[PDB]
């Protein structure tokens with residue numbers, strides 16, 4: 001049975017790695033957390049340290065407040081009965097205001113006002129988390145690729161809960177907070193707009209979502225297949241190409257007639273994934289603002 | 303033409319079938335016995351689609367569609383224009399896919415690399431075969447398989463899902479989706495991380511993997527590391543396709559009612575089924 | 584119609600993105616070459632991108648790509664046919680000559696450095712604070728090759744300091760010298776380390792390193808290529 005490098009055979013540990021310093025404010029870094037031998041069978045064993053400046057505390061505070069606002073509504077719906085809470089957990093739902101309230105904030109607490117409070121908390125949590133992704137890269141002198149990619153996911157989120165409701169004229173267009181209820185909303189959105197399978201941006205979003213699994217399967221398998229030549233040390237393979245990077249390239253050249261580089265495959269990777277939510281957010285934003293029925297639109301445009 | 307570094311790798315050997323008979327290249331493409339096989343299977347399958355197009359009537363890619371035999375034919379043969387062309391094309395497609403995978407294995411052996419890539423491709427093949435072979439056979443008719451047409455196979459997705467209500471409620475389908483979304487999240491992060499290290503702020507030196515671990519520890523308190531992230535991408539993507547095949551092989555076989563109703567087994571558990579209040583009480 | 588303009592704009596953006604991505608992935612290995620090393624006539628429809636320069640840390644210099652490609656080493660292979668596209672036969676011992684699946688690249692003959700400027704990979708005995716933390720400790724185990732004969736004994740683990748993982752096993756041979764074995768090419772068992780890639784008689788030919796406490800990128804490529812080469816070239820000695 002040849003070894004396949006899926007699970008580590010021998011873990012080694014040394015002094016806890018406190019990380020690179022560059023321009024990072026070291027006062028705002030925690031200490032290192034525990035070591036997880038469990039994780040170490042697959043990835044790194046070390047937990048922490050984490051950086052928690054003011055923006056991080058704000059974002060984590062909003063995020064929990066958003067989560068707690070939903071959960072307090074769930075407890076109310078459960079009649080404060082813990083057995084009811086666990087039984088119906090996926091069935092509870094904190095729903096936005098009804099259409100009559102439009103974009104107003106006048107809706108009663110139990111009739112959309114609580115949804116608006118939870119959503120406000122979510123807005124602050126996500127955008128301040130976005131600033132964290134920019135600032136932690138800046139402190140380390142690194143490119144801003146993570147923050148730009150994150151902005152692509154934020155795009156779809158902003159469209160679903162904020163931009164599209166505003167353009168449609170009411171908060172009732174937004175997604176409710178609940179496991180089953182937001183699935184119902186998703187199915188309903190498609191029926192009300194004449195089947196999203198006719199939305200060309202929805203079909204592109206699927207191509208890139210399938211494509212992301214294809215590509216990460218390809219790339220993840222390729223790196224493991226050349227990890228016997230240090231393949232996963234990708235930054236140094238970029239700086240000084242080794243036989244790992246050459247064999248990886250030639251597997252794909254010989255298979256499909258073209259190939260990537262150790263750097264360029266990460267540009268395919270970032271764009272494949274980023275275009276999922278980029279095209280997806282366009283497809284949603286166009287739905288009901290400009291196109292009421294994708295079936296009808298397709299009869300006239302192709 | 304060869305990549306500048308390529309000639310040293312183009313040595314004899316590694317074939318699984320045929321010795322040195324097909325051990326050669328056509329431009330960039332390696333051939334081998336399974337390259338010949340792939341070409342044969344894919345050529346005939348495309349020929350039959352070009353043919354099965356006119357027995358249907360058209361030559362537009364958005365309308366050509368090779369439908370399988372109607373359910374009345376069961377698991378038996380069917381006249382060419384009435385579903386037999388679909389059956390032969392499906393055999394060709396399986397032949398082309400499996401031959402492609404085995405040609406990948408030969409390429410792996412010649413390059414001295416591990417077999418991870420064709421192993422991963424085999425998951426996609428098995429998902430394909432679940433929809434066109436394993437599920438129809440368990441349900442008793444090729445007609446449950448999907449048609450080969452750009453827009454018609456979407457029709458089949460919609461018709462099949464809505465046979466069971468909102469297909470969102472299939473629990474294996476929920477797991478499959480979680481892996482698809484998480485995989486795309488992991489792909490964005492991985493691509494962005496390596497690139498942010500290799501392309502730092504202007505005039506700065508390339509960062510190291512140490513900076514990569516540090517960025518993610520600063521961000522979320524953990525870094526899976528450069529080996530682990532590639533294990534992860536492979537595992538998330540294969541897991542998604544595994545649960546995709548799983549969510550379909552069980553649908554219309556062991557579960558055939560509306561998937562939303564499956565979740566009653568939880569609601570009707572003895573110790574809370576009849577407590578008043580909430581949504582289901 | 585706004586949607587129809589958006590989808591038309593998008594396909595144009597996507598064509599430009601694919602052009603950019605493909606040209607970005609030509610910063611290595613291009614221009615294409617004939618089997619004799621001269622520039623090939625057909626380069627494809629994509630032109631080489633404008634060069635970029637990577638600034639390497641710790642005074643290691645820079646890398647500008649695309650740039651003049653050269654193998655910087657002799658390649659002991661010869662044609663087996665009178666036309667293009669056929670395999671090239673090793674002119675000597677391909678494991679010793681480093682061709683085929685035994686190939687190596689002339690990477691820099693310096694060790695990779697961590698972010699502080701220290702050697703990334705060190706023998707564990709020289710790595711302060713580092714120890715086996717889980718799994719079977721291989722140090723002390725006999726090493727068995729694919730001929731089912733014992734080729735030596737593990738005397739240390741070479742560890743990646745900044746990433747905290749095992750990268751090589753240091754194996755001592757019958758004559759008292761050691762070799763590095765890639766960690767991804769050995770199977771640690773309860774009573775042995777088994778190495779499918781190499782027969783016992785080929786362990787002596789594993790390329791040696793110059794310094795006992797560090798390994799250079801060039802040395803790692805020669806070690807890893809050699810061991811992987813045995814999968815093809817040691818098959819006459821691989822039992823079962």
Ligand code: BCL
Nearest residue numbers: 202203204206207208210211214348430448452453455459
């Ligand atoms: C997987 C679950 C469902 C299904 C659900 C959906 C849904 C829902 C959608 C698609 C979409 C598409 N699917 Mg489908 N699809 C299925 C099975 C298949 C099979 C197959 C042999 O099993 C194939 C080849 C395709 C192919 C396709 C494309 C026409 C399109 C974009 C996919 C993509 O980029 O993926 C990622 C892969 C890549 C990026 C790599 C490149 C792949 C190329 C584009 C495949 C082209 C195939 C060609 C058109 C037909 C065969 C050509 C032969 C030479 C004869 N589907 C099954 C039945 N598929 C989308 C669309 O727009 O449809 C109109 C869409 O919205």
Ligand code: BCL
Nearest residue numbers: 153154157186187189190197202205206209280281283284
């Ligand atoms: C019956 C249901 C309808 C339908 C209705 C919809 C609707 C409605 C939508 C989609 C959308 C999508 N659909 Mg569809 N869809 C159907 C059929 C399919 C089929 C199929 C095989 O049949 C497939 C493969 C897909 C696939 C897809 C995706 C390509 C796309 C979502 C991308 C994504 O990553 O979102 C997941 C990613 C996000 C939501 C981004 C989230 C970003 C934020 C910032 C994260 C916040 C985190 C928060 C703070 C919580 C923190 C947690 C703790 C930290 C742990 N659909 C049918 C026709 N589909 C979306 C789209 O783009 O359509 C164009 C969409 O809105």
Ligand code: BCL
Nearest residue numbers: 426427429430459460462463468469470478479546547550
């Ligand atoms: C109205 C429709 C229903 C519904 C009904 C269905 C049905 C029905 C099915 C799915 C399936 C899936 N659905 Mg659903 N689905 C809905 C809503 C969604 C939403 C959403 C956001 O609402 C999402 C994200 C999903 C997600 C998914 C995935 C879990 C899965 C598709 C991927 C897959 O199977 O790949 C597996 C990959 C393949 C099959 C590809 C195989 C490729 C082969 C091996 C090679 C092709 C080579 C090619 C021919 C080469 C061409 C030449 C080259 C291009 C040169 N569904 C709604 C509720 N869904 C499908 C599934 O699980 O299938 C198993 C399925 O059948």
Ligand SMILES: CC[C@H]1c2cc3[nH]c4c(c3C)C(=O)[C@H](C(=O)OC)c4c3nc(cc4[nH]c(cc(n2)[C@@H]1C)c(C(C)=O)c4C)[C@@H](C)[C@@H]3CCC(=O)OC/C=C(\C)CCC[C@H](C)CCC[C@H](C)CCCC(C)C
Nearest residue numbers: 059060063064067125126129149150153274483486487490
């Ligand atoms: C480009 C498309 C893909 C994408 C990209 C993407 N997402 C990103 C990024 C990128 C590039 C980031 O950089 C960023 C990140 O940091 O990732 C690590 C992020 C991220 N994407 C996330 C989620 C996410 N992404 C998704 C999807 C995608 N992300 C796309 C497929 C999805 C879905 C629905 O598919 C989700 C759910 C987060 C992990 C992170 C953004 C984090 C954020 O905004 O956080 C703000 C909230 C908080 C800081 C706190 C929230 C508190 C929690 C609700 C927990 C409550 C439980 C806790 C245990 C409470 C205790 C209670 C008990 C006592 C009961």
Ligand SMILES: CC[C@H]1c2cc3[nH]c4c(c3C)C(=O)[C@H](C(=O)OC)c4c3nc(cc4[nH]c(cc(n2)[C@@H]1C)c(C(C)=O)c4C)[C@@H](C)[C@@H]3CCC(=O)OC/C=C(\C)CCC[C@H](C)CCC[C@H](C)CCCC(C)C
Nearest residue numbers: 210213214217344347394395398402422423425426451452
């Ligand atoms: C398992 C994880 C993901 C995965 C992995 C994966 N796919 C892979 C690999 C891997 C690891 C490869 O190595 C291999 C490859 O070479 O990629 C470049 C491949 C590949 N995955 C591909 C496609 C693909 N993968 C997909 C999905 C996935 N691939 C998963 C999400 C999808 C979809 C729909 O999600 C598609 C379309 C190809 C690019 C390639 C395999 C190419 C191949 O087999 O070539 C030989 C066959 C031909 C050249 C043509 C055969 C033609 C047929 C005889 C006739 C047509 C029949 C067909 C049923 C018609 C369908 C019509 C449609 C409109 C429905």
Ligand SMILES: COC(C)(C)C(=O)C/C=C(\C)CC/C=C(\C)CC/C=C(\C)CCCC/C(C)=C/CC[C@H](C)CC/C=C(\C)CCC=C(C)C
Nearest residue numbers: 068070071119120123157158160161162175177178179182
């Ligand atoms: C044990 O119980 C306790 C109390 C401990 C708990 O805490 C239990 C907690 C729970 C049970 C939590 C349960 C939470 C869920 C089930 C969450 C489910 C949420 C989803 C499935 C989200 C789906 C999509 C959500 C979207 C798309 C949100 C979009 C948000 C908007 C973009 C934000 C827009 C902002 C607005 C409208 C406010 C505008 C006002 C301004 C001032 C700007």
Ligand SMILES: CCCCCCCCCCCC[N+](C)(C)[O-]
Nearest residue numbers: 030031032033047048522523524
């Ligand atoms: C995404 C996984 C999140 C894991 C979070 C781990 C945080 C580690 C911080 C622990 C702090 C240790 N100490 C001693 C300072 O308390």
Ligand SMILES: CCCCCCCCCCCC[N+](C)(C)[O-]
Nearest residue numbers: 032033034035036037038716717
């Ligand atoms: C928050 C405390 C910070 C350091 C604690 C480290 C915990 C590591 C525990 C040893 C791991 C070995 N074990 C027993 C899990 O196998």
Ligand SMILES: CCCCCCCCCCCC[N+](C)(C)[O-]
Nearest residue numbers: 105106107108109113116117120
């Ligand atoms: C902390 C929340 C920040 C304000 C944004 C959301 C406004 C909440 C509106 C709730 C409505 C309350 N009231 C009295 C009108 O019923």
Ligand SMILES: CCCCCCCCCCCC[N+](C)(C)[O-]
Nearest residue numbers: 199200201203204207211271272
């Ligand atoms: C960065 C990777 C580029 C891959 C591009 C994939 C193109 C898939 C085309 C699917 C067609 C979708 N649609 C809506 C037109 O039907």
Ligand SMILES: CCCCCCCCCCCC[N+](C)(C)[O-]
Nearest residue numbers: 256257258259328329330331627
């Ligand atoms: C765009 C989705 C499907 C694309 C079809 C396959 C792309 C062709 C890539 C093969 C090119 C190999 N080539 C020409 C260099 O030899």
Ligand SMILES: CCCCCCCCCCCC[N+](C)(C)[O-]
Nearest residue numbers: 257258259601605626627628629
């Ligand atoms: C969507 C993925 C397919 C994109 C096709 C990319 C270009 C393939 C042809 C590259 C040519 C290789 N060549 C001959 C220049 O070496």
Ligand SMILES: [Fe+3]
Nearest residue numbers: 219223234496
């Ligand atoms: Fe990578």
Ligand SMILES: [K+]
Nearest residue numbers: 707708710713
């Ligand atoms: K030590």
Ligand code: NA
Nearest residue numbers: 306307620654
């Ligand atoms: Na050359």
